[PDB]
């Protein structure tokens, strides 16, 4: 239900300790929670919005030079003086021409010359900064009701959406039939603002960090500035041409729009047209589930004769999904759904739409379950008129251990120490893991910055070669945490 | 003297008439009649498909996208031959002569 | 080489290797730019629509 068919989804179960669990969720993925009760929910972060931005610095992109004036003076007598050097719209440069009697001054030396032209901008590029307050995520919560035609739809108001701010609180979600779920979200430490700048071309906008945005070779201008004429770094958008030793001239230096669309590689695009809608990053959510009902508890079992109305089809991650329809009487009831092996003894393989339900009519209902890694029967009824359905699930024996390992390592490569916040109070394992991971990410962060796709691989191979030829058991520490790790981060970078 | 242009690059362009086309995950690759037109730019990729996408079979279906590439600023690179290349040299003596 | 008003003097093999969409010396309803991929970029966010 809104989770199915979307790739890179993931499962969490275990609400141990109290009645909570830690989940972290990005904008691309969506998270399915499970328990021994407490019906399976689907969480997805759909918006990130910055409400009130304040501009930081306005850069120029396309300029023009009008009122080209120049002035020269005979050699060994000072510098030329010109009234347009006073006003700072005009860009200036001193150079040396050679003069004589043909140049009409005498003394046959190398005179001085100035040139001036006013710097009019006609295309801006403004960056904006936002506080870590006054920003408003939107997370949507969809229970596995198994409702008719509500599966994997990014459309549809089948689930509740709540808006969470750092000025907000425990944020109950009154979603009907199932009770009320509360979320202790941590939105301040989500994507690390007070570094991001939100620069903006004509109709596009990006998300770069502060120390990259400030030191650009474009002529800049501060944010609190009306009458935007006093451009400050004007000499990086003009060229002073003194080809021979004759008089010199000024030129404008084109448009750096497509030049800076080259410069904005590796910087995730956001959508600043109407509202500062981000669609990147994550946030960490503490999820308390003490007040979830089950919506199907205190219903009797079923009479029989179900009917499949849409053929089953496994997804990725090996979870089938079937739509069945009830034919019979006593319509609010459970569904006798179970996956058994051959020869009908063991009930192996679990459900994801746990406690399925027939509701209010003969409306078809969706059931998701996880079969075992071979052939297995599916039993969707009681004994007069069941529905035995064969199913073969490919692989799924040892490849989901290496596949789960690659999902965990990819999560530890994208997320930092926040990747350890995907489980519930390890104590001697989880807190120690993110402590060592945050000091190692601190050391690794104070290196490798500015280093691209290639050079992480290159000096990774260098560190492996220094390891493989060293002695005194520094070789193992010179491979296992630096060499192959920086090669893996060399491959899994620039998403 | 006689320049003949060799090749002209584009500087600033414009994209109109954006069309796209997707298809079911196991059912091969999509195709458009705009794809064989040389004034349209295309690149295959793939999306996620399922019952919410009105598809079935829950996989990764291919997708194409088109756009009519239109230029509006050119850079004509002309070239000349070594003949009809006409220099000009002034000759002047040291006539002791005013100005 | 020629811009709108400015003009340069570059050599051939540098001029032929610039990644930028091109078309031969006769335009005549050109509409046939060759390496068009160097001046567009196709975004596929989230493995959703592109």
């Amino acid at each position, epitope marked *: 239900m809104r989770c199915i068919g979307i790739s890179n989804r993931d499962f969490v179960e275990g609400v141990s300790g109290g009645s909570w669990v830690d989940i972290v969720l990005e904008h691309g993925s969506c998270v399915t929670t499970m328990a021994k009760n407490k019906p399976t929910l689907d969480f997805e972060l759909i918006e990130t919005e910055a409400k009130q931005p304040a501009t930081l610095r306005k850069y120029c992109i396309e300029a023009k030079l009008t009122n080209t004036t120049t002035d020269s003076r005979c050699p060994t007598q000072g510098e030329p003086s010109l009234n347009e050097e006073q006003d700072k719209r005009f860009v200036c440069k001193h150079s040396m021409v050679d003069r004589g009697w043909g140049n009409g001054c005498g003394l046959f030396g190398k005179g001085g010359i100035v040139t001036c032209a006013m710097f009019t901008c006609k295309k801006n590029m403004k960056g904006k900064v936002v506080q870590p307050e006054n920003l408003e995520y939107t997370i949507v919560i969809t229970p596995h009701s198994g409702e008719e035609h509500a599966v994997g739809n990014d*459309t*549809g108001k089948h689930g509740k959406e709540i808006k969470i701010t750092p000025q907000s609180s425990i944020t109950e979600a009154e979603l009907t039939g199932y009770g009320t779920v509360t979320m202790e979200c941590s939105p301040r430490t989500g994507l690390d603002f007070n570094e991001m700048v939100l620069l903006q071309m004509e109709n596009k906008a990006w998300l770069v960090h502060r120390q990259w945005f400030l030191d650009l070779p474009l002529p800049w201008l501060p944010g609190a500035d009306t009458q935007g004429s006093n451009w400050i770094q004007k000499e990086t958008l003009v060229t002073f041409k003194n080809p021979h030793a004759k008089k010199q001239d000024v030129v404008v230096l084109g448009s750096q729009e497509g030049a800076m669309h080259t410069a904005l590689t590796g910087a995730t695009e956001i959508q600043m047209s109407s509202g500062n809608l981000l669609f990147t990053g994550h946030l960490k959510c503490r999820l308390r589930m003490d007040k979830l009902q089950l919506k199907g508890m205190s219903y009797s079992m079923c009479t029989g004769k179900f009917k499949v109305v849409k053929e089953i089809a496994e997804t990725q991650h090996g979870t089938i999904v079937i739509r069945v329809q009830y034919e019979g009487d006593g319509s609010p009831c459970k569904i006798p759904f179970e996956i058994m092996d051959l020869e009908k003894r063991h009930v192996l393989g679990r459900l994801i739409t746990v406690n399925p339900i027939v509701t209010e009519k003969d*409306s078809p209902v969706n059931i998701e379950a996880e079969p075992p890694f071979g052939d297995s029967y599916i039993i969707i009824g009681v004994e007069p008129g069941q529905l035995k359905l064969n199913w073969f699930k490919k692989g799924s024996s040892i490849g989901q251990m290496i596949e789960t390992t690659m999902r965990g390592a990819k999560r530890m490569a994208i997320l930092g120490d926040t990747a350890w916040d995907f489980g519930s109070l390890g104590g001697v394992f989880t807190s120690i893991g993110k402590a060592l991971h945050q000091v190692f990410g601190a050391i690794y962060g104070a290196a490798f910055s500015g280093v691209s796709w290639i050079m992480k691989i290159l000096i990774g191979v260098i560190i492996t070669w220094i390891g493989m030829n060293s002695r005194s058991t520094s070789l193992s520490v010179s491979l296992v945490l630096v060499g192959v790790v920086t090669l893996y981060l060399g491959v899994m970078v620039q998403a | 003297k006689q320049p003949a242009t060799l090749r002209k690059y584009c500087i600033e362009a414009k994209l109109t008439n954006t069309t796209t086309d997707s298809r079911c995950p196991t*059912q091969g690759e*999509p195709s458009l009649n705009e794809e064989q037109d040389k004034r349209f730019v295309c690149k295959h990729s793939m999306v996620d498909r399922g019952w*919410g996408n009105g598809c079935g079979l829950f996989g990764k279906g291919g997708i194409v996208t088109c756009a009519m590439f239109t230029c509006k600023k050119n850079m004509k690179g002309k070239v000349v031959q070594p003949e009809n290349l006409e220099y000009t040299i002034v000759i002047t003596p040291h006539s002791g002569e005013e100005h | 080489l020629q811009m709108e008003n400015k003009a340069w003097l570059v050599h051939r093999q540098w001029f032929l290797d610039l990644p930028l969409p091109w078309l031969p010396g006769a335009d005549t309803q050109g509409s046939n730019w060759i390496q068009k991929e160097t001046l567009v970029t196709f975004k596929n966010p989230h493995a959703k629509k592109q």
Partner: antibody
Amino acid sequence: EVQLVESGAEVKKPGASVKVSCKASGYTFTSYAMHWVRQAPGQRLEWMGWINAGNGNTKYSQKFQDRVTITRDTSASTAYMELSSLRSEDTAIYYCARDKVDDYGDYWFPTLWYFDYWGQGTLVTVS
Amino acid sequence: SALTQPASVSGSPGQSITISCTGTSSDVGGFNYVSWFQQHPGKAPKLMLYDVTSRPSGVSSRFSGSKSGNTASLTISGLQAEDEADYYCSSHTSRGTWVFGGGTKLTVL
């Protein structure tokens, strides 16, 4: 609970620019799309309207690609349908349609249950 | 490219009537977007059947559809006098355009 109403048009001349609006109520307008389908009397339902959103994009129909333009306004919570270059066969009933936009703003995949609630339709004539 | 449902069908009140639409591989045979409508002559048509077989709220659980390849159907059990309407169809394509059916007139007497 969801109501869509239109603006009545009386009579037009061939070659003019007919215009019909759509006042929307019962929902937030910036999160649902708006379509425009037409039906000649006793004939087939011909799709004209294009996929709108909070930004207001289009998706050009094959038959009506270079003769019709649609606009909207979020501040009045309406959508505008303007067909120009009217010929003799353009007289029909003009319908509206509701569809739910994807939650990321950008709308390409339609809702499974597309075309839920429609307007009553206002007829136009050319002569 | 359109849909080819027949001109007009009729039957006795109480039996089953079938209304089929034959489509191509880009509008019906590939995707699960096919919706049904009914149109009274003094009424705007309302949505009558969802994606292939699913049903709107309201209507009384007797309008069953199917897709048997390139053909999409609408089987109506229990004909009544309130079912005299113009039954049109619709589908969403892979191109991005919506197509529609030709049009069937259903009478009971």
